[PDB]
Amino acid sequence: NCERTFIAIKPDGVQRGLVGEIIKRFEQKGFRLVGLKFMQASEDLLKEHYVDLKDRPFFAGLVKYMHSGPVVAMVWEGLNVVKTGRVMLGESNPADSKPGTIRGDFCIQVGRNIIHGSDSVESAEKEIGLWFHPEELVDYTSCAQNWIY
Amino acid sequence: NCERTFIAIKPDGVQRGLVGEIIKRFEQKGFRLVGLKFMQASEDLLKEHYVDLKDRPFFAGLVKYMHSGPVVAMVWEGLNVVKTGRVMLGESNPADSKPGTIRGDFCIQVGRNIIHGSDSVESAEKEIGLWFHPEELVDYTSCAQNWIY
Amino acid sequence: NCERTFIAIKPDGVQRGLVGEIIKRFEQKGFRLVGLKFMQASEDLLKEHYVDLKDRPFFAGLVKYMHSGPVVAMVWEGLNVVKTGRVMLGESNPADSKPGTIRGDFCIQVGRNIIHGSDSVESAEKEIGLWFHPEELVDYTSCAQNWIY
Amino acid sequence: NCERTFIAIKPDGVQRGLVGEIIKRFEQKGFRLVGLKFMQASEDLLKEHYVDLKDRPFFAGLVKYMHSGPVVAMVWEGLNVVKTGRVMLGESNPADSKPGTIRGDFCIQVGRNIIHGSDSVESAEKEIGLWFHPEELVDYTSCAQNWIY
Amino acid sequence: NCERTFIAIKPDGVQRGLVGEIIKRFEQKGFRLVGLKFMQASEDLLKEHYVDLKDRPFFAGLVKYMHSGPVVAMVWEGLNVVKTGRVMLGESNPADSKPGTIRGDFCIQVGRNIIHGSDSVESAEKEIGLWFHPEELVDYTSCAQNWIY
Amino acid sequence: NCERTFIAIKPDGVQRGLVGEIIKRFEQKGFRLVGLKFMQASEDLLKEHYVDLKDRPFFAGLVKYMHSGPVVAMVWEGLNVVKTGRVMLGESNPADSKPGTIRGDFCIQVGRNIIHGSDSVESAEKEIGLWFHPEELVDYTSCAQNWIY
């Protein structure tokens, strides 16, 4: 119930005016927003984040594209939030994401996926600790918690 | 073509302001609204409704929760409405409902699934007879029936 | 704060699938739904309701049109709800209602204004007592009252 | 990346005011609109289009229904547009289309499928050449192409 | 009731993906779409259209901007359609258009006002005859005319 | 064209899930998001912000309410952004805000106006300097600037 996930809206999602539509989807699903911040991602930070896929031919291109514009990084809290976030985001390859998701609604290519989300409950914490300072994680109580859980 | 289903918006979905968004989904799908009323469900009525799942550990909790606030009960009429309503509503367990449905959009927990729908064409008639009086079921002809069918 | 208004969606707005969109507008404004009921309006009831405008050339036409299909009658509760309801509904004459309202969004003619609302806090009570039985007015407490008032 | 598809909104989809909601879906997905026109389809044109399903019991009914009102015909250009358009449109049989698609959101019957789309990259070109003149196909560059691809 | 207006979505509104959101606004207001086509406006056509404002310092800039991309030209038919369309579009100067209109929602600058509309019932006919051939104007009967007028 | 405004979503609008709907409105209007951050406002910060209305009977209540939950603070950049933001937000008193604005859509009481905006181009700079560090103000170029201006 205190489980948290890390979602990052990419510069493709920022110059396409997609920040509000995704936040509304998460809020109306019912997850509690814990952290929200708007940076220009540094290359060292991106390499630390994507060391998992570093040994890929497209890693350099991914880093260069991601350090082109600003990113919207958010932390969402709730029950099964990590898995529900991937379900809502859809599959990365656009030839596989169904309509009704986020990628399946706003994505055409795989080299730009507009949105990124944590895969596991360990990667989620690793990304939150890497991106957000512990003091920038608001812990409040929503007025709809009794009507969610 | 005169098939009818029973949909009930629970107090979880009433205090979250979800009555309009579901009615729009059904109306834009194209089903004809036959009955609509707004009550506080009595415990005897709830027990008669949920006698199917009475022999479950969570039956008492379900009855106590559903007799807390007001429910929005409606009857929709159309072709294959009973099955199409379940398809639109989605699966009860939130870890199985896909985005684009109602539960997959607004639900996080199984204990409060915000919406309830008839499973079979016999349970639908049973629930309609149990909840609505036969005089509160409007039988009109929509202006778009010639195009719907 | 316990002030209540009476809104009635006409059959013209019922065959156009406008029930959900108006309910969403009221709910997202933040008023608390107290009564909701779906009937076929009887001519005697309509005459008792419109005795105010009975001495008009279009009274008979209004009654005949209103007793053609079903009406959605709702009661909304909140602060300054009667005046805010007229503000949201807009002006009756379509050549005067601004965009962003309900009539200014979905209305073209004055003979079918899709929606009707109480004018004063006395007519509101007169209409509520005339249409709804006192037992069909649910008195619950919303979870967002602390974040409305 | 220059791949093109043919989509046709049927007179049932025009009578129900569904033209804007589909165009917005395609635009927000990110495809580039190339052709758009609003006509009354002739029976010879429809027979040439549906010669594939001519040897079916419902061919005459399909042609007669389609030559009743006006059709909106559009051409969309993008990567994997032919397959992605079919995915967004959903399955023809309403008892198989999932919510979140176009048919799964606005369709109840199979005899009227509100929308029609090309199945393969060859049928797409055959339909574009059949329905549009080569001079009515705009070739511009969008301001968001650098992000989409 | 057979009154018609001319609306043109400009290339600024075409590369911003605003075609669907405006068509849906007009359709939900309830006007009947008569003509729709997607062209690249020629400079001679634009000069004939804007001869009224030809003797202005910004006429050449207006023509050069308008002949840059493709425009969407539509004809809408209804009661008081010419005046209602201007009301819905809003005022040209962005520092005067209120929220809820089209310009007041999607416009920041006067040089790119996304949309253009006929001012009077004579200019409307002058623009329709200038832009559309008489054979490209569909004259059908909508299924909701009884509930518009 | 480099004018900037300060908008703050209050905890009243944060616990009601209104963050996405406002961001969409600003983005679709066309203003460029420069800064975005999510904090719990400190009482000293609030007193420095509201020293203008400090000599009012409701100043203490305002500060106590504002330091109850988290606020969403953002900076928007564009042409006439300071005045356009107030126009979009609407009047503070709910009995004066028209539908189509933000307050006129989601506000019922003046004590909780969900949103706050800078009044003048000097107060905007004062609030930006007071709330955001100069390093947290991203200066990128959108892909739609060539069309907006």
Residue numbers in the entry:
A (entry chain D), B (entry chain E), C (entry chain A), D (entry chain F), E (entry chain C), F (entry chain B): 3 to 151
What does the paper say about this structure?
A major role of NME1 is the synthesis of nucleoside triphosphates, other than ATP. Oligophosphorylation was critically dependent on the catalytic histidine residue His118, and cryogenic electron microscopy analysis of the modified proteins suggests an intramolecular phosphoryl transfer mechanism.
For this, purified pS94-NME1 and ppS94-NME1 were vitrified, and cryo-EM datasets were recorded and refined to final resolutions of 2.8 Å for pS94-NME1 and 3.3 Å for ppS94-NME1. The resulting model for pS94-NME1 revealed that the phosphoryl group is directed towards the His118 side chain, with a distance of 6.6 Å between the monophosphate group and the N1 of the His118 side chain (compared with 7.6 Å in wild-type NME1). Our hypothesis that NME1 oligophosphorylation proceeds via an intramolecular mechanism is supported by the cryo-EM data for phosphorylated, pyrophosphorylated and oligophosphorylated NME1. Both the phosphorylated and pyrophosphorylated side chains are oriented towards His118, with a distance that would be compatible with an intramolecular transfer. Even when the enzyme concentration was increased, the overall activity of pT94-NME1 was approximately 100-fold decreased compared with wild-type NME1, consistent with previous reports of a T94D mutant, which may be regarded as a phosphomimetic. The activity profile of pS94-NME1 was very similar to that of pT94-NME1, reduced approximately 100-fold compared with wild-type NME1, suggesting that the pS94 mutation is a suitable substitute for pT94. To validate this hypothesis, pS94-NME1 was freshly expressed and analysed by MS/MS, indeed revealing the autocatalytic formation of a pyrophosphate group at Ser94, and the formation of oligophosphate chains at this position. By contrast, neither wild-type NME1 nor the double mutant pS94-NME1(H118F) showed any higher phosphorylation states. These observations suggest an autocatalytic phosphoryl transfer between His118 and prephosphorylated Ser94, to generate the pyro- and oligophosphorylation states. In fact, when pS94-NME1 was treated with ATP, detection of the pyrophosphorylated intermediate was difficult because it appeared to subsequently convert to the tri- and tetraphosphorylated species at a much higher rate.
